[PDB]
Design a protein around this ligand. Structure first.
Ligand SMILES: [Zn+2]
Length: 30
């Protein structure tokens, strides 16, 4: 149905936007 995060538990709809969420609120290994 939707796409979820891989760090917390916040969803958007599809990868399309979700990608951004991650980079800024989790910032891979930065
Ligand atoms: Zn997240």
């Amino acid at each position: 149905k939707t796409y979820q995060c891989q760090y917390c538990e916040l969803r958007s709809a599809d990868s399309s936007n979700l990608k951004t969420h991650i980079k800024t609120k989790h910032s891979k290994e930065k």
